[PDB]
Design an enzyme around this catalytic site. Structure first.
Site, mmCIF file in Angstrom:
data_model
loop_
_atom_site.group_PDB
_atom_site.id
_atom_site.type_symbol
_atom_site.label_atom_id
_atom_site.label_comp_id
_atom_site.label_asym_id
_atom_site.label_seq_id
_atom_site.Cartn_x
_atom_site.Cartn_y
_atom_site.Cartn_z
ATOM 1 N N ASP A 1 -19.287 -7.338 36.643
ATOM 2 C CA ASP A 1 -18.370 -7.460 35.527
ATOM 3 C C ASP A 1 -17.027 -7.706 36.225
ATOM 4 O O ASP A 1 -16.970 -8.397 37.245
ATOM 5 C CB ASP A 1 -18.361 -6.138 34.750
ATOM 6 C CG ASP A 1 -17.856 -6.286 33.323
ATOM 7 O OD1 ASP A 1 -18.005 -5.315 32.548
ATOM 8 O OD2 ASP A 1 -17.310 -7.361 32.977
ATOM 9 N N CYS B 1 -19.579 -8.932 28.539
ATOM 10 C CA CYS B 1 -20.283 -7.939 29.404
ATOM 11 C C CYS B 1 -20.158 -6.543 28.798
ATOM 12 O O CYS B 1 -19.546 -5.652 29.385
ATOM 13 C CB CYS B 1 -19.676 -7.940 30.812
ATOM 14 S SG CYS B 1 -19.501 -9.574 31.588
ATOM 15 N N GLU B 2 -20.721 -6.369 27.609
ATOM 16 C CA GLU B 2 -20.671 -5.087 26.915
ATOM 17 C C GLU B 2 -22.044 -4.426 26.856
ATOM 18 O O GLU B 2 -22.208 -3.292 27.309
ATOM 19 C CB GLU B 2 -20.089 -5.271 25.514
ATOM 20 C CG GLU B 2 -18.660 -5.802 25.530
ATOM 21 C CD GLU B 2 -18.063 -5.954 24.145
ATOM 22 O OE1 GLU B 2 -17.727 -4.921 23.525
ATOM 23 O OE2 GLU B 2 -17.921 -7.107 23.679
#
Lengths: 253, 253
Positions: free
Chosen positions: B203, B1-2
């Protein structure tokens, strides 16, 4: 109270407080005039801006909630509703040249301005941005490789001189180090040397507060279209006068 | 989750609720991982990067919201506190080419990457920005004048291919209209068509909420390093796969 800059020798606090919208006699009633505030955090730059607004926007809340602390600040408040709208037409403008982010803010109007398209091209339709890119093209052409400030200084003055021949050209330019100023109509400044106490500058619908000194060697200079505090050391600039700031000190003028 | 992007056919709302700092098992304890979000408003772009505060007296989990509305969003929501890498080294990066603001976000590491200096130069020190500038130089060299996406498409694919030979190169590029994606390691997407109900992507220390449709013709595509919602129509991308989005629709791949 349109153009607003600051050059300091230590990262200093600057709190912007936009008075929330209100029903008045004329100015910032149901709506709000466009604004922009860019500042540096090392070589990096932060930009918060917004065109004409009928509501208290999130970006307007963002500048106020962010603990700002920099050596270089360039902004343009109450930008004339003249012409077109949209974010692409809101000052200030940013563009990298030589591995540095350049910031530009212009107050005034240019007639029959039609620079030759070059490396840099405006995203919006403002004459201000067309002027910014053009000035950038002249600096890039004359200096392909990074050159000290004094070297590229003449090209800056030259372009400003030409632009003022076509209208009012009050401008603030910076690469994050120095802060170039140019006066055509009106511009002013005031240098504060440590020790100094907190000061409150203000518009009719704006307030920018400054704190006390960080170190006994602080030097912070504020530049505005006109004095925001009752005349003290506020020096008024005349037409054609430019000043190069860096660390709150005058480098050349 | 970047990495996280979005391409839609109508200006859609996206609220980022950054779960305030809290003492945990490992992740976002007293400190905060950096983040950066860029989005357009017409041809203009807005960029917000993590505040240089995070010194919240370590008060119980205090979530902070960041409302955003746009047709094109590109963000890097898992970096390092801007105090650790610095503002000049925070994604995404912006630069104008052809009178449009180009946004760029990259996930992955590059080894022995040394592009030849050109028109554009990184202000910061990341290989990511060094890559962005190189790709822009290749596009500006091959296309001196503005050209249709399809024509500049091959050069975008070429550059990425080369960079992936030196490391992981997951990237998101955009000029405000289209959203280019490139996968090396992992990237995924999910297109939602009207009618659709509100969705909450999350996230571990973040939550990005989406609302229902604005019109019955809505199309909104979300791109992330990996599925944020329990797999539905989440299409997984393999190494070497690129996609050119526009209005939430696939233009080419």
């Amino acid at each position: 109270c349109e153009l607003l800059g600051m050059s300091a020798n230590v990262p200093t606090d600057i709190v912007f407080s936009f008075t929330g919208l209100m029903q008045r006699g004329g100015g910032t009633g149901p709506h709000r005039d466009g604004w922009g505030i860019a500042f540096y955090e090392g070589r990096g730059v932060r930009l918060f801006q917004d065109p004409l607004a009928s509501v208290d926007s999130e970006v307007a809340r963002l500048v106020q909630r962010f603990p700002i602390k920099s050596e270089t600040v360039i902004g343009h408040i109450r930008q004339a509703n003249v012409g077109k709208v949209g974010l692409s037409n809101t000052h200030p403008f940013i563009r990298e040249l030589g591995g540095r982010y350049w910031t530009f803010a212009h107050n005034g109007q240019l007639a029959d301005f039609q620079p030759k398209p070059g490396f840099y091209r405006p995203v919006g339709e403002t004459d201000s941005e067309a002027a910014f890119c053009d000035l950038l093209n002249r600096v890039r052409r004359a200096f392909p490789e990074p050159v000290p400030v004094e070297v590229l200084l003449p090209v800056l003055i030259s372009a400003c001189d030409e632009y003022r021949k076509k209208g009012v050209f009050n401008a603030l330019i910076s690469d994050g180090d120095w802060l170039f100023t140019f006066c055509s109509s009106k511009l002013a400044y005031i240098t504060r040397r440590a020790p100094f106490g907190p000061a409150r500058l203000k518009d009719a619908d704006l307030t920018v507060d400054f704190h006390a000194e960080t170190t006994p060697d602080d030097v912070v200079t504020v530049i505005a279209t006109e004095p925001l505090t009752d005349n003290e050391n506020w020096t008024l600039q005349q037409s054609g006068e430019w000043v190069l700031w860096w660390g709150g000190e005058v480098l050349a003028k």
